[PDB]
Design a protein around this ligand. Structure first.
Ligand SMILES: [Cl-]
Ligand SMILES: [Cl-]
Ligand SMILES: [Cl-]
Length: 163
């Protein structure tokens, strides 16, 4: 574990992370996709061998010895708000299990279901709170990656609020 487990946020490409493993915002079919998923495919394409997994689950595939945790958040275009919320919470609980199993001291993680899977809604707070619920009991350093300057500020404030 980390000596003093922390949360941090960076505004940059998760494919350039400085952590011991990465969470992919995957699709259920293990396709290259777009956004975070396409950047992950370009950086770690070997990790997409048998990466297909259902909504609400996480499946780890090694690229060399570097773990890529494929986490499948719901597409809120397809799910009801209620069912989507349940699957989004579940995807993050499965990430916590994988991070624990791997024994890493740090993990790079995007906010699941906040991009093309958001169903055109702002889900920063919803997605981040489910990330916290899952990861709070783990002792890995968590580094959240985002692309928007306003999101960086909001995520940083939410981290600092808990102290
Ligand atoms: Cl960048
Ligand atoms: Cl997304
Ligand atoms: Cl963002």
């Amino acid at each position: 574990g980390a000596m003093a487990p922390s949360y941090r946020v960076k505004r940059m490409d998760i494919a350039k992370n400085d952590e011991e493993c990465v969470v992919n915002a995957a699709n259920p079919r293990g396709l290259p996709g777009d956004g975070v998923c396409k950047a992950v495919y370009k950086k770690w394409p070997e990790s997409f061998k048998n990466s297909a997994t259902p909504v609400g689950t996480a499946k780890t595939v090694m690229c060399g010895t570097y773990p890529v945790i494929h986490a499948v958040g719901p597409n809120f275009s397809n799910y009801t708000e209620s069912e989507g919320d349940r699957e989004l919470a579940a995807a993050y609980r499965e990430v916590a299990k994988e991070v624990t199993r791997l024994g890493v001291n740090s993990v790079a993680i995007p906010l699941l279901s906040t991009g093309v899977y958001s169903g055109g809604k702002d889900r920063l707070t919803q997605s981040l709170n489910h990330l916290f619920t899952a990861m709070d009991s783990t002792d890995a350093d968590v580094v959240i990656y985002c692309r928007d300057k306003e999101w960086e500020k909001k995520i940083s404030e939410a981290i600092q609020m808990r102290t």
